[model samples]
Target chain A: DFAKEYADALYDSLGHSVLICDRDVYIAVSGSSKKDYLNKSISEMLERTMDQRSSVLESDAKSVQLVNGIDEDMNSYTVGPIVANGDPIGAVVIFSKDQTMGEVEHKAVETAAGFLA
Target chain B: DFAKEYADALYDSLGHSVLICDRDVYIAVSGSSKKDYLNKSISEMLERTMDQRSSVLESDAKSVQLVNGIDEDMNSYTVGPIVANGDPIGAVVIFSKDQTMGEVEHKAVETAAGFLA
Candidate 1:
């Protein structure tokens, strides 16, 4: 309930699909999608978190690059670490189809991840 | 437990005092201070949430200005709304003593509020 509520806020604010994952598990998702395009990226990000315990991706292009074979319509994505007690617990990913990710969106996604942490 | 972990992370990363409040009640707090300097400001911020249901303060100075009689050592503060299903549930406040609030810190506090949402 908490994840969905906050994820929805992020979705509406950014007008992009968003996912909230705990470690590597999908806990909440919003926007449109049938395929699990984020699974590999999620796992990689989770692994990276284990190593660094910080945000897995810094920018949109890097986040999109982490996942393979995304739809052409998919423009960009951003990921932020969900940290608790200085350790990574999960992450929040936001995907945009119509525009490239910017500082505002990146910050928003990261902020949403804070809730999950 | 969850709040403390996340709040601690935010505290450690930002190096500023942090407070998490759920509907006007203090849930988590970090950094320095013995006096309840945040009480009136927290109540005012909560009241604003009841009316607006969004972040109560956008910048640090306005945040600090909301409270009365803060110590001279206090520099600035930031407040963000915690929302669930588009409704306000609580807020996160970050206070700084040595530096002016910046975008990075502001986003961190707002992101931390997402968890409470």
Candidate 2:
């Protein structure tokens, strides 16, 4: 509850789906997050961000929708690394539905990523 | 050069403009950052991030484009607070052209922001 609790709170405040993950697994999923994304390799799904270890807005949100059968087109998703002890071990993700991805949204994910560290 | 040097490194490596700043003034400006943006109040522009202390991708990068007399549409500018001593004091901004922004770019700015602390 501790982990998902915080994520859920963040999700509520941001009005967006939130996911906390490691290299290969989803550690926490916000309330609105889909089961399809939970089933896929969180690592593989966010491979680019995990491999590069930077935060990024997905270039092709529609592709993710097609692959996961997700209802949202995922047009506004951001993936940022979760670093621990100086190494990137996981990621924090944010998904908005055509809502502007403003500084508040970026801060939510990025700061949450920092909290994990 | 230490401050600008690092910003320069990040700018060169990311192939984007990066700006490090205090609330009222920029501490470091990447090689490609525009003068118009530099002239404006860094604090006024990033006021939201300062108040929220969160990172955000502007909802209307176009607004910034017009405000700063920018040549680039700036469809992708992300701003996260530069934190020190557990407080939000400033911001680190990343600007990308029409090119897609990925984890590499996010990490470059996020990690660099961390370095300042």
Candidate 3:
């Protein structure tokens, strides 16, 4: 239900596909083109973001390193930790292809993480 | 700003105009058709929602009482309190016209409140 309400909105508003993960497992995805890239173990960057309780943005050469090289097509991405009861539960990740990420996209992913919390 | 990022998306996705209030003060609103009705004191229903830390739904004759009788055109509305650190800081309110609201809309508003938090 959370995915149905938020994933599509995040995808349409930000022009990036949305992926929701619980701990290390991908549970929901908005864009079908990226489905094959999701549903795997959480990336080092994502784990760091969750541990730090912050948003992480990767672009250019670094983007491919996210999720441990799950999607080579990804040129930019942002991952934000979802916190519940002041602890990290999961993460909300947005993937972008062939574009650089900005503060707006970063904040959107962070806010989406809050919603998941 | 939270308003710029979320209000339009909430309106577009939920099919209901959105209003955000901080401690009973109107802060941001989406859907210009209802703009004139948003900037005002918090209603009894909204206050109750915040105090209770829950979602409140008003419809039919009860809707007119929201925001202290501000928008007579509103036939239904849902208000959800925005909580931070387990405390209510504000609310996210959605207004509907001439239609009975359902659980979906109620949950949407509640999730939006979580974003504001």
Candidate 4:
């Protein structure tokens, strides 16, 4: 899916952390500078909230906020419509250390999701 | 675990280029051509008795005989155990000139033996 394409693109250019989760799997992962995390179980996501909740349950453009236990100031974003047109797809979560840049990256992921949709 | 599965699935679409040696570290690869032989080590595979030498080895069913040293007139096949059940089972070796079919081949022979065996 476009997850790999987005991940690769982000990895090659932005060096950001990108993760895409399907109902029961991590479809693609890249740009985290973590090769080991690629193709791993979604349950293994560093952010437990994403791991705890199934992506398919989320409906429209609702976004979730995650507070990084590691650093009080650090945070991440999980955005997308797991269900579009009554079909349950998945979600793309981007972990950003710089909260200021969240909107920019979210837009990038949104654009990527549009391509996949 | 998935090495053999991946190797076997890879073999169905691709051709032979794989080896299994539990004592050593090298994993499976794809088929090899003459170029691979020239660079391979004897502790790899050399004489008509492929059992004695080969950089890496693949396995055939038991009861198969493999003569090494690149049979100019005939092709060779070597296969055996590589710690299948925690023992030093050997490997199979085949020689052909039409390389390039191998996308995933064996790791290395003695390396396979020393690393994986």
Candidate 5:
């Protein structure tokens, strides 16, 4: 029941985009608001510019925070550990609008992490 | 000057294994202690246990702490933002043996994250 419900919910969350990648290939992408991100390489979309933050290749995979330069805002993105049985599969990153470290965002990450696990 | 010095120092740290990957590929790995981890896919090396964690595919990277489970101890790992010229590169993770969440580990993560940036 939970699996089906969560799958439905994930599909319905049009605001939050979902990209599933395998072996450097983007397998699937879904989201109404984030339709523009479809069919793009994960490395391409998240690639870091030299003058931007750190080059994307040099950043850590677990935790990396960014401060908005043009918008003069503070934001955060968290990468959750997606495990299956006892091994690491991939990760589910949550890009949020509110950078306040809100409960919803935390809960979302936790849920996603659990699912991946 | 700084770049070359740091690079040399990194190479000299044979105790620390270094693995460079593009998505899931294990491009390069060097380190005597971690040599056994080479010649394998990141997924294959880490794909065994779903209980393990991954450090790929992250955004907005910030700080996270992990509790150590083995040896019946507690440990923590934190990631810092790696920025270059304003962009983010890949991150460098410093794996520590201590699990007490002590101040030393915290500082190590900070230092490694800075280097990654």
Candidate 6:
């Protein structure tokens, strides 16, 4: 699927684990797929952003951090909304090792989300 | 429509004229209106890129100069493919002022195209 192709391209381009979804179902995931996260759900954070139709970048996601225990790679995640036409289709989630994403990275996520629609 | 909102957001973010299309039809257009470009066709360049499902950035487009003489804003243009669920959906076209877009800018166009699917 182009979605996985997209994630692979983005993984190489942005140096981040890119996971794309359509609503609650996973479409394509890169970087962390070898791990157990391939089956990860819609993630509460992802759902919240989709519900609001607003983006949750590094700064915004920190308002409320991990609900579960400190999972190693869950240190910093960025969620961007994906809307096709006028409807909310899904979200693109970016994962970082530890460091919070900078504005440049955040904007990249937003820009990535913009073209899908 | 979120497409319009997405284009508006991209316009403010990328500082370029962002136009997103679903197939040959325009979805959201920014930075160029009010003249006679509102009903522009699927531009030969855009169709070629969509057909190839590959991108055409500044450097690539320069190989062949203007089909129509140098129209101010037509100095350079970038085109990226948009695919959803493994199918070709449409494309995203970006317009710059006069200078050719750098690698950073080109990647931004590609990355923007990645998230839609």
Q: Tens digits of per-residue lDDT for model 2 on A66-100?
A: 12233556567777677667678878787765664
Query: How displaced is residue A91 in candidate 6, in Å?
Result: 0.4
Q: CAPRI band of model 2?
A: incorrect
Q: Lowest-lDDT window of 10 residues in candidate 2 chain B?
A: B63-72
Error of 5 at A22 (Å): 4.3
In model 1, which regions exceed 4 Å deviation?
A: A1-6, A12-15, A22-27, A34-53, A58-76, A81-90, A98-117, B22-25, B34-50, B58-74, B82-89, B102-115
Ranking by DockQ: 6, 1, 3, 2, 5, 4
DockQ of every candidate: 0.17, 0.04, 0.05, 0.01, 0.02, 0.23
Ranking by TM-score: 1, 6, 3, 2, 4, 5
lDDT of 4 by residue, B57-111 (tens): 3332222222233333323233333343443544433323334211123321221
Tens digits of per-residue lDDT for model 5 on A24-55? 33334444233433343444233232113221
Model 4: per-residue Cα lDDT over A1-117, one tens digit each: 545765565444344566666655557777554453445445433234433333221222233332222222334554443444555465565555554334345444443443344
Best by DockQ: 6
Over 4 Å off in model 3, which ranges?
A: A1-18, A21-117, B33-35, B59-62, B69-71
| Clash counts for the predictions, in order | 3, 8, 0, 41, 46, 1
The window of 10 residues in a row where model 4 chain A has the poorest summed lDDT is A53-62
Kindly list the per-residue Cα lDDT of model 3 for residues B28-75, writing each as its tens digit. 777654456456787776777798997877765443655665646667
Listed per prediction, chain B TM-scores read 0.74, 0.75, 0.82, 0.29, 0.35, 0.75
Off by over 4 Å in 6: A59-75, A84-87, A98-100, B1-15, B18-106, B110-117
- Model 6 chain B: which ten-residue window has the lowest total lDDT? B64-73
Question: Each prediction's TM-score against the native?
Answer: 0.63, 0.44, 0.51, 0.33, 0.28, 0.55
A8 Cα displacement, candidate 1 (Å): 3.5
Per-candidate Cα lDDT values, in order, are 0.61, 0.61, 0.69, 0.40, 0.33, 0.63
- The digit string of per-residue lDDT tens for model 2 on B2-110 reads 4576566556445567787776667677756456455455645576676777666653465353233334565577775767777877777777656555544554455
lDDT of 6 at A69: 28
